[PDB]
Design an enzyme around this catalytic site. Structure first.
Site, PDB file in Angstrom:
ATOM      1  N   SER A   1       5.178   4.053   4.172  1.00 35.77           N
ATOM      2  CA  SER A   1       3.781   4.210   3.421  1.00 35.77           C
ATOM      3  C   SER A   1       2.840   4.831   4.012  1.00 35.77           C
ATOM      4  CB  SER A   1       3.426   2.695   2.869  1.00 35.77           C
ATOM      5  OG  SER A   1       4.428   2.042   1.954  1.00 35.77           O
ATOM      6  N   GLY A   2       2.071   5.818   3.442  1.00 34.50           N
ATOM      7  CA  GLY A   2       1.179   6.442   4.133  1.00 34.50           C
ATOM      8  C   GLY A   2      -0.093   6.842   3.476  1.00 34.50           C
TER       9      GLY A   2
ATOM     10  N   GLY B   1       0.857  10.041   0.426  1.00 29.82           N
ATOM     11  CA  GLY B   1       2.338   9.954  -0.278  1.00 29.82           C
ATOM     12  C   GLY B   1       3.201   8.969   0.489  1.00 29.82           C
ATOM     13  N   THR B   2       4.293   8.822  -0.226  1.00 29.36           N
ATOM     14  CA  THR B   2       5.255   7.457   0.273  1.00 29.36           C
ATOM     15  C   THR B   2       6.546   7.902   0.230  1.00 29.36           C
ATOM     16  OG1 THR B   2       3.656   5.619  -0.326  1.00 29.36           O
ATOM     17  CG2 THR B   2       6.079   5.116  -0.397  1.00 29.36           C
TER      18      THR B   2
ATOM     19  N   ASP C   1       2.648  18.969  16.459  1.00 25.86           N
ATOM     20  CA  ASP C   1       2.720  17.597  16.687  1.00 25.86           C
ATOM     21  C   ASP C   1       4.093  17.068  16.994  1.00 25.86           C
ATOM     22  OD1 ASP C   1       1.221  15.178  16.623  1.00 25.86           O
ATOM     23  OD2 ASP C   1       1.232  14.807  14.652  1.00 25.86           O
TER      24      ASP C   1
END
Ligand SMILES: CN(C)Cc1ccc(-c2cnn3c(-c4cccc(NC(=O)c5cccc(C(F)(F)F)c5)c4)ccnc23)cc1
EC number: 2.7.11.1
Length: 262
Positions: free
Chosen positions: A18-19, A22-23, A129
């Site tokens: 989970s974020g 979006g998931t 990143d």
């Protein structure tokens, strides 16, 4: 070609991450897939853009050391589908379950990471990143590079992998192949010590200030004894405070392959 996947085809299963934006679920589609959804039902032209941009970058990639893009859909929710990775991120192995890899295996993981990064740059792609979190050990064997963050659109940043010039924000675009070479330099550090840089400093603002001002740099003396001299030397060249003084991936990849054979 057409990488769109009609709705209905994919059978969404267990939620795995989970974020903020979006998931990600495990899914069924001619086998196992990973599916990153958007969840937000009404997408702003802001998000609809970043969707295209990500997909556009992914479809440019065909390398075993890069997470395999497989398709996307826009039907009910924006979604991107990738190969299903069985295992754990490098970060996880190193700093959570502290898996003890053999020196031969560590060097190997470094080589595969270089390979992918060589490829990404050759295709004119700056990751921006790279870090142990974004390196998956597929079945504890094959390195898969990706971007597994469910946040950034800048967001936070894990500054441990961030090069002095990025930490210092002079120029709109401080990111470069060498800035990626620096993040990789930190990854090498993690591999050769099993540790994160600056473990003994508990203040994020001071790490940022000190790294960017040049006062602070990874403690290179924490490298395991069984770590080959050629490796430490390479690692040091990657982490040079001065951008233009860092090697690029062809040269790095060469250095690793050469030192691996002995
Ligand atoms: C283990 N926990 C921390 C939980 C947990 C956290 C995160 C995830 C997770 C996050 N995304 N994602 C994916 C995924 C899905 C769709 C798209 C992407 N785009 C990329 O990869 C990507 C995007 C741009 C550039 C690149 C690059 F590489 F430059 F080519 C890669 C990743 C697949 C599998 N799994 C995850 C799972 C568990």
């Amino acid at each position: 070609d057409d990488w769109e996947i009609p709705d209905g085809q994919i059978t969404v299963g267990q939620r795995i991450g989970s974020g903020s934006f979006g998931t990600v679920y495990k899914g069924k589609w001619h086998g196992d897939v990973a599916v990153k959804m958007l969840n937000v039902t009404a997408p702003t032209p802001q998000q609809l853009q970043a969707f295209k941009n990500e997909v556009g970058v992914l479809r440019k990639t065909r390398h075993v050391n890069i997470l395999l893009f497989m398709g996307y859909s826009t039907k009910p929710q924006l979604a991107i589908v990738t190969q299903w990775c069985e295992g754990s991120s490098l970060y996880h192995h190193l700093h959570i379950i502290e898996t003890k890899f053999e020196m031969i295996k560590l060097i190997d993981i470094a080589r595969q990471t270089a390979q992918g990064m060589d490829y990404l740059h050759a295709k004119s792609i700056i990751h921006r990143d790279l870090k142990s979190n974004n390196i998956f050990l597929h079945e504890d064997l094959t390195v898969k590079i990706g971007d597994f963050g469910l946040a950034t659109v800048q967001l936070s940043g894990s500054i441990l992998w961030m090069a002095p010039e990025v930490i210092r924000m002079q120029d709109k675009n401080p990111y470069s192949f060498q800035s990626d070479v620096y993040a990789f330099g930190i990854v090498l550090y993690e591999l050769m010590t099993g540790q994160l840089p600056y473990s003994n400093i508990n203040n994020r603002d001071q790490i940022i200030f000190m790294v960017g001002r040049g006062y602070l740099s990874p403690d290179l003396s924490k490298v395991r004894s069984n770590c080959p001299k050629a490796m430490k030397r390479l690692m040091a060249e990657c982490l040079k405070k001065k951008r233009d003084e860092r090697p690029l991936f062809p040269q790095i990849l060469a250095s690793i392959e050469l030192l691996a054979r002995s």
